[PDB]
């Protein structure tokens, strides 16, 4: 999984261990190994939501599978909870998009995932 978290909160408010907690949470929720999870944090961004600069997080999650309708309810609960605890965001200021990728559309280790598997 590849995760991008963008917030208008300053970097100061995103704790040093946030990426590590998000990695653990998604490893468990998605049944994926930590060694295949990347997290990018962009803080202090110019973001509006509803045309106001209230604190907000916009999150993108890409994965090959583990993104069923039921799975995404669980991932959303867990990610939203982490944002509430660590960033003090309200739930209506956490926006997540999930991209369920075909293995022919992911390169890793010098080839596609499709070309590396049975």
């Amino acid at each position: 999984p590849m995760v991008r978290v963008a917030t208008n909160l300053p970097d100061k408010d995103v704790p040093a261990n946030f990426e590590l907690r998000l990695t653990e949470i998604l490893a468990e929720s998605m049944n994926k190994p930590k060694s295949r999870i990347a997290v990018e944090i962009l803080a202090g961004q110019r973001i509006t939501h509803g045309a106001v600069r209230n604190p907000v997080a916009v999150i993108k999650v890409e994965s090959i599978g583990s993104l069923s309708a039921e799975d995404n309810i669980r991932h959303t609960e867990k990610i939203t909870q982490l944002c509430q605890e660590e960033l003090k965001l309200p739930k209506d200021k956490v926006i997540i998009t999930y991209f369920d990728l075909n293995p022919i559309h992911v390169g890793f280790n010098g080839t596609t995932v499709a070309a590396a598997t049975v």
Copy 2:
């Protein structure tokens, strides 16, 4: 809807009200509430186009619906016009990608849009 605007133009050239105008324009063009539109601006970025640093804006629009073939002509006209007026970019330096998302693939307010609707 979630909109990301990246440009190699300096932040100076992207006026303070750009996000607000883009919000209004897309609320009207897509028939969605302003309160459900997020805009991210990344200015002063390291971007090339044609392998040199000519001014460019690269825009991503994610939405559940309101992204039909006909809709996207309209959105493109309006977004491009705003970039012409406010950033002084030519229309061939405004590149937009639209992602039409299934409601099971969007989390908001602690659950998926599908599960809430």
Copy 3:
């Protein structure tokens, strides 16, 4: 094609000609004109992979076509090679996602690509 390269390597380690080389390589591999290739570099980013801050590159490639199963093997090899030569990344620290866009979903020159073509 619209290409986004995010790395936790400092900007210093991403040479000034990286975008130019990537443009040429993808123009050739994807049979697309240089004048329709944009490359964004985000360097010095807060990125973890496997919950560590080891050097990593996360790359997104969007295009109308030129992203078949076979094409993507080739693109992955060439992009990974460039990252090895210029950024000194190991191949298991280069992650690429490919998005194959319908022409109705791309705005360019003030209209959609679909609306501008035969």
